[PDB]
């Protein structure tokens, strides 16, 4: 069920690989997040943002789930839309890609993060398998059908591959 997705970094000839078990919820994407130790920090981020990540313990005042805006955005693969890229304290560096997409409507972790930083919350699975909405070509498909179609579309565009 898992898929590795390549997000294009806006303004750069560079890609970020993220992994999701829930690729059918991609139209609910509000952000992407990498671990503190992700090499994209040293490769692409400003001295000031690198300095912050190396000097400061990332811990929340109000909420435990917190992050640092990287100064980088990612292009949504199916919408004419940019997503902010964060370093977040709840992403494991050594687990899969050390990088996630945020779906606050359907992931309780992403939800708390999105609330903390006023990031968009976009519902895409109707409460009942359940029906997709706010999801363009996935609209009206069951979660099962949508999982199949989204992976086909990602593979067709060469931006996603099935990953066990
Ligand atoms: N967030 C949006 C969407 O993407 B999912 O979020 C990603 C990914 O699919 C999933 C990993 O899949 P897997 O268990 O290895 O098959 O966990 C998050 N993740 C992947 N790399 C990660 C990493 N370095 N550090 C922390 N977290 C990671 C995800 C959900 O996941 C549930 C399972 C989970 O939580 N599995 C976990 N595995 C290890 C820590 S959490 C649930 C709902 C939704 Br809508 C989603």
Residue numbers in the entry: 222 to 349, 359 to 394
Paper text:
(A) Overall structure of the Wolbachia LeuRS complex with the adduct AMP-Cmpd6 bound into the editing site. In the absence of AMP, Cmpd6 and Cmpd9 did not bind to Wolbachia LeuRS; however, in the presence of AMP, the compounds were potent LeuRS inhibitors, with dissociation constants of 44 and 6 nM, respectively. The potent nanomolar affinities of the two compounds are explained by a combination of multiple polar and hydrophobic interactions established by the inhibition adducts in the editing site. Both compounds make equivalent interactions with Wolbachia LeuRS, except for minor differences in the 2-amido-thiazole and amino-methyl phenyl groups of Cmpd6 and Cmpd9, respectively. Furthermore, the oxygen at position 7 hydrogen bonds to the side chain of R330. The amido-thiazole group also packs against the adenosine ring; however, the π-π stacking is not entirely parallel compared to the phenyl of Cmpd9. Other key interactions, shared by the two compounds, are a hydrogen bond by the oxaborole oxygen-1 to T241; and the three hydrogen bonds established by the 3-aminomethyl to F322, D328, and D331. In the adduct formed with AMP, the phenyl and amido-thiazole groups stack against the adenosine base and enable multiple interactions within the Wolbachia LeuRS drug pocket.
Here, we report the discovery of potent boron-based compounds that inhibit an unprecedented target of Wolbachia, leucyl-tRNA synthetase (LeuRS), and demonstrate that inhibition of this microbiota target is an efficient approach to arrest the growth of its host. Altogether, these experiments show that benzoxaborole inhibitors of Wolbachia LeuRS are prodrugs that, in an enzyme-independent manner, form adducts with adenosine substrates.
